[PDB]
Amino acid sequence: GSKWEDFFRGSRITETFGKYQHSPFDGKHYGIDFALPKGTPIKAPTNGKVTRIFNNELGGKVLQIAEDNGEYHQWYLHLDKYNVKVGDRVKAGDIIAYSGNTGIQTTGAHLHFQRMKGGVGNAYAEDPKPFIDQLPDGERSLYDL
Ligand SMILES: [Zn+2]
């Protein structure tokens, strides 16, 4: 009826690239965290091809993609469902998966996008922010809201 209005505040990002707290014991986040409703399709930011597909006990489901120059990598943690297989070519704006609260103990879902160069792992990560900064629809080149 009359009452429905949103308790909105700020943008959808939980955490960007950097340390969790002061002191050296709470380490670095190597990605970007888009808070999403469960079942939202994740879109390809760039044209590329799938390298690896696997499921982690604490990070949930994981998709790995490679860019067309072959040096840059793209991780996608906290998926409900895949829309591609290993060895599929993709094109920017195409659905590659759907995000869901997999790995997460109680909290709502967030797409963890992790951007890497020369290989894949924490040390290979660069920064996702300046990459999204040039995309056709920005962060909406990665999700369907
Ligand atoms: Zn994250």
Cα 20 to averaged position of ligand 1 atoms, centre (Å): 10
DSSP letter assigned to residue 143: B
Catalytic residue among 29, 73, 78, 110: 110
Distance 92 CA to ligand 1 centre (A): 22
Cα–Cα distance for residue pair 17/23, rounded to 1 Å: 17
Measure the CA–CA gap between 88 and 121, rounded to whole angstroms.
21
Let me know if 83 is exposed, middle or buried by CB neighbors in 10 A (0-12, 13-18, 19+). Answer: middle
**Alpha-carbon 77 to chain mean position:** 6
User: What stretches of 18-109 adopt beta strand conformation (E)?
Assistant: 18-19, 28-29, 32-35, 41-43, 48-56, 60-67, 72-82, 89-90, 95-99
CA of 94 to the centre of ligand 1 (A): 22
* Domain range 1-145, its CATH number among 2.70.70.10, 3.40.50.300, 1.10.10.10, 3.40.50.80: 2.70.70.10
Is 112 catalytic? The answer is: no
- Report the candidate in 30, 59, 24 with the shortest Cα–Cα distance to residue 124: 30
Distance from the alpha carbon of residue 89 to the mean position of ligand 1, in angstroms:
25
What was the structure determination method? Answer: NMR
